[PDB]
Each structure stands twice: as structure tokens, then as C-alpha cells.
Design an enzyme around this catalytic site. Sequence first.
Site, mmCIF file in Angstrom:
data_model
loop_
_atom_site.group_PDB
_atom_site.id
_atom_site.type_symbol
_atom_site.label_atom_id
_atom_site.label_comp_id
_atom_site.label_asym_id
_atom_site.label_seq_id
_atom_site.Cartn_x
_atom_site.Cartn_y
_atom_site.Cartn_z
ATOM 1 N N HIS A 131 42.243 -2.863 37.464
ATOM 2 C CA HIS A 131 41.142 -2.418 38.386
ATOM 3 C C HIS A 131 39.652 -3.343 37.818
ATOM 4 C CE1 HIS A 131 43.209 1.575 39.157
ATOM 5 N NE2 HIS A 131 43.915 0.536 39.777
ATOM 6 N N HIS A 156 43.934 0.122 48.291
ATOM 7 C CA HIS A 156 44.275 0.037 46.760
ATOM 8 C C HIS A 156 45.009 -0.891 46.265
ATOM 9 C CE1 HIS A 156 43.355 1.446 42.717
ATOM 10 N NE2 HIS A 156 44.736 1.341 42.474
ATOM 11 N N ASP A 160 44.874 -3.590 43.658
ATOM 12 C CA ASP A 160 45.796 -4.104 42.535
ATOM 13 C C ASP A 160 46.282 -5.411 42.479
ATOM 14 O OD1 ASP A 160 45.603 -1.382 41.486
ATOM 15 O OD2 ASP A 160 47.571 -0.773 42.383
ATOM 16 N N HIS A 214 53.229 -3.877 40.221
ATOM 17 C CA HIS A 214 52.934 -4.550 38.987
ATOM 18 C C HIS A 214 53.819 -5.594 38.578
ATOM 19 C CE1 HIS A 214 49.237 -2.187 39.047
ATOM 20 N NE2 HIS A 214 49.806 -1.028 38.809
HETATM 21 C C1 L58 Z 1 48.780 3.385 42.913
HETATM 22 C C2 L58 Z 1 50.091 2.954 41.769
HETATM 23 O O1 L58 Z 1 50.451 1.769 41.874
HETATM 24 C C3 L58 Z 1 49.257 2.801 40.380
HETATM 25 N N1 L58 Z 1 48.756 4.174 40.046
HETATM 26 C C4 L58 Z 1 49.704 5.184 39.337
HETATM 27 O O2 L58 Z 1 50.745 4.850 38.815
HETATM 28 C C5 L58 Z 1 49.009 6.639 39.017
HETATM 29 C C6 L58 Z 1 48.006 6.990 39.912
HETATM 30 C C7 L58 Z 1 47.332 8.156 39.563
HETATM 31 C C8 L58 Z 1 48.030 9.147 38.665
HETATM 32 C C9 L58 Z 1 47.675 10.586 38.417
HETATM 33 C C10 L58 Z 1 46.705 11.193 39.394
HETATM 34 C C11 L58 Z 1 46.313 12.551 38.978
HETATM 35 C C12 L58 Z 1 46.691 13.357 38.115
HETATM 36 BR BR1 L58 Z 1 46.209 15.164 38.005
HETATM 37 C C13 L58 Z 1 47.876 12.858 37.227
HETATM 38 C C14 L58 Z 1 48.177 11.721 37.351
HETATM 39 C C15 L58 Z 1 49.444 8.788 38.138
HETATM 40 C C16 L58 Z 1 49.605 7.545 38.295
HETATM 41 C C17 L58 Z 1 48.064 2.183 40.336
HETATM 42 O O3 L58 Z 1 46.743 2.614 40.806
HETATM 43 N N2 L58 Z 1 47.970 1.029 39.379
HETATM 44 O O4 L58 Z 1 47.060 0.141 39.448
HETATM 45 ZN ZN ZN Z 2 45.575 0.847 40.723
#
Ligand code: L58
Ligand code: ZN
Length: 301
Positions: free
Chosen positions: A80, A239, A243, A266
Site C-alpha cells: 500500500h 483495492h 495492490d 501478490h
Molecule cells: C485484499 C487482499 O489481497 C489482501 N488483504 C488481506 O489478505 C487481509 C485483509 C484484511 C484482513 C482482516 C480484516 C479485519 C479483521 Br477483524 C481481521 C483481518 C485480513 C487479511 C491485501 O490487501 N493485500 O495487500
Molecule cells: Zn492490499
Amino acid sequence: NAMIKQRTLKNIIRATGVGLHSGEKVYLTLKPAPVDTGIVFSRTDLDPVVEIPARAENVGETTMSTTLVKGDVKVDTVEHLLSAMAGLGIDNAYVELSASEVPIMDGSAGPFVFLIQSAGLQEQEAAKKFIRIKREVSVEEGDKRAVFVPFDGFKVSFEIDFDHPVFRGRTQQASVDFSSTSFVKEVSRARTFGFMRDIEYLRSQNLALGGSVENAIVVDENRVLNEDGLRYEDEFVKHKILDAIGDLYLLGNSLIGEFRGFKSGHALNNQLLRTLIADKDAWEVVTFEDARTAPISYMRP
Ligand SMILES: C[C@@H](O)[C@H](NC(=O)c1ccc(-c2ccc(Br)cc2)cc1)C(=O)NO
Ligand SMILES: [Zn+2]
């Protein structure tokens, strides 16, 4: 003529937050860096201080976030912050961290783009180097695909595939052409997201300790749980675009070409970079001595 110049920060930026995966409190410091340094992460909590250039060869783990590694020293969830750096055209910077993971902030690149622009950008006395895609390069694994296509500018297409009531319609695909669309306005505010069933599994294993509705969209079997709603009608696919931009910035230079992703993450994004880097006939380094003729435009510093 006015050349497209390399950029760094005008002033030091300071941020505090928590790691999404680790749940640890972290102090982030963005510093100006000399020409041709690139983005370099620094673990200032360690003795001696460990520096990790934000480059494809330094990518370790790619399971839920992009991780940089040097020996057994890690910098987790760089995507990010690198998305914000790419979006604003920052070439050179020192990213100092007091812990192994970049703070998650609000789950988007929004707070980073705001911190950078608050400090301001500094043009440097050296031409900005771009990587121009000359030939198509693709990687696949099962039904996931990631492709580089020659294109005169910078464009990112992404498609996701969730069989879920919240993910119907044209909201599962998006294309952003940065000649007519602002990274800041249309991409930067898109937050990370997770499904309640996956989150319960992660929690059961003491994983994703920093996650909450304050730094992510949380979706159960039928709806978005965040009381305040979405920032974009297609926030989830935007999003994934955010990424892809951050992961692609591990090339070490801005791209002149097109990225298309289908259910890409990723891991596949980094496999695409590694394949492009290995295929030297598919790309070339270019500079623009006259900004007028350039197919990519950056905001004024
Ligand atoms: C979108 C997906 O590719 C990734 N995000 C995740 O793997 C991820 C996002 C949020 C949570 C999470 C959100 C809220 C809570 Br409560 C706990 C975990 C866990 C993993 C990401 O954004 N990578 O950059
Ligand atoms: Zn992300």
C-alpha cells in the site's frame, strides 16, 4: 525542453500505526534519498541497521501481503505504501521502520498519499527512468493470470471472481488509464478487505492481529459489516488495482505499458515481474528529455 525528472521527498514524513498481520505498534519515517537510490526500507530497531531495497529480487513471502526479506530480517505489507509512492511518482526514498511491518493506517493508500503530499515532492537533477513494455509477457497458475501488454501510457485492468451476493454486476472488473484518471481520486482511498469466514480462521491461528473494521472492509456471507459503507461502488476491485500498482513498483522504475490481472495476487504479481525481468527482449529503459512528448504525466511537485 523540460525533462521528466526523478523525484524524492521535500521533507521528512512521520507516521505511527499498527501492523495488520503482527498487530505491533510501528513508527514509520519517510526520508529524502539521493538520485538512483530507489525506495529502500530500513529496520532502525535492529543493530546493525538492516536496509532492504524495494526490488523484486528481495521479495520473500507473498501469502497475504508482499514481504521483503534480507537474511532473516523482514519488512511485511509494503504494497500500500509502494502503491502511494508509485502513484505520486516518488523515485528515491528511505523508509525507516521501528518494526517488521508497515502500519496498515485505514487500509488504503489514502493516508500515505496525504502524508507525502503534505511534506511535498522535490524534483532532482536527473532524468526519471521508465521501463517500457516492448512485448507481451504473461504468467498463469490455475485460473489466475497476470499480463504485461505494450501500451503508450500506464493502464491497470483487474477482474475478481467472488460467488457472493455483494459481488454481482460490473463491480467485479475495472480498468484505470492514468492519462485520464487520477490515482489519488479514483484508486488511493480503496481499502483492504476480508471475508468473515477467512478472518475467523486467521484469528483461530493468532493471525492478522491488527485487523478491524477501522482498517479494512469486513464482509460476512451476505453484507458489508462496516457501519459507514463503501468509499467506491467497486471498492474491492479498486483495492486489487491499488495492490497491483504497489507490487509492480518493485520493478524499481515506473512502467510504460499495461497490466491486466485476473484473480491475481501478490505471488503471481511477483512471478510476472520476475518473468519480465528475465525476458530482456520484452522491455527497455527510456527517459523523456521533453515532458511534452511523454505518454505518462505526473502531478506537479
Ligand atoms: C485484499 C487482499 O489481497 C489482501 N488483504 C488481506 O489478505 C487481509 C485483509 C484484511 C484482513 C482482516 C480484516 C479485519 C479483521 Br477483524 C481481521 C483481518 C485480513 C487479511 C491485501 O490487501 N493485500 O495487500
Ligand atoms: Zn492490499
